[PDB]
């Protein structure tokens, strides 16, 4: 039911409601699905909109149709830092944003918000060495979803992240 409540607010504010972030972007390869799932977090279910007023406007719409509440990412005044270009020269790592493709070019600011300068590495020992092994710390994620924060916090659990990385392939068109 939330699919066509979603389709209804897109036709109610054309140009203003871009859609759910999972529908607006895709990881470039399947190997990156779990890592992108982990880094994006709850933002992959965020409805990206132009402005915060239209976010509240769609809040009032779903409030009127008994439907379950959703979260909205207003784009226009997003607190976001520019992507650190120099990190592309880091051996063993590429940027998490550099590994997502996204539907319109406006959406890049939503990914910059959700990824920042997070890096994806091919294995845990690489992610650990890039995160903590240098003088500057980096936010890194390995392919199994193990994430290393700059604060030193580590998190993971690959089968729970695999069960929601399959969402990347199932929302791809129902052929029927």
């Amino acid at each position: 039911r939330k699919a066509e409540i979603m389709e209804s607010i897109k036709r109610l504010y054309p140009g203003s409601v871009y859609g759910r972030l999972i529908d607006l972007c895709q990881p470039t390869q399947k190997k990156y699905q779990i890592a992108v799932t982990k880094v994006l977090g709850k933002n992959m279910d965020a409805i990206i909109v132009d402005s915060e007023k239209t976010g509240r406007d769609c809040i009032q719409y779903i409030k009127e149709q008994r439907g379950e509440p959703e979260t909205f990412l207003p784009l226009d005044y997003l607190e976001v830092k520019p992507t650190d270009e120099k990190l592309r020269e880091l051996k063993g790592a590429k940027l998490v944003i550099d590994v997502i493709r996204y539907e319109p070019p406006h959406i890049k600011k939503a990914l910059q918000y959700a990824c920042g300068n997070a890096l994806v590495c091919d294995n845990v020992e690489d992610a650990r060495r890039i995160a903590f092994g240098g003088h500057q710390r980096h936010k890194t994620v390995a392919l199994d979803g193990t994430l290393f924060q700059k604060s030193g916090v580590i998190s993971g659990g690959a089968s729970d992240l695999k069960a929601k990385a399959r969402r990347w392939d199932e929302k791809a068109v129902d052929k029927l």
Binding site: V124, D144, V153, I154, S155, G156, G157, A158, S159, D160
Partner: peptide, 16 residues
């Protein structure tokens, strides 16, 4: 986490 994921174990864990 390496053995956690080897065994395909359920859950989310965060370490300090």
């Amino acid at each position: 986490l390496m053995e956690f994921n080897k065994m395909n174990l359920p859950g989310e864990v965060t370490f300090l």
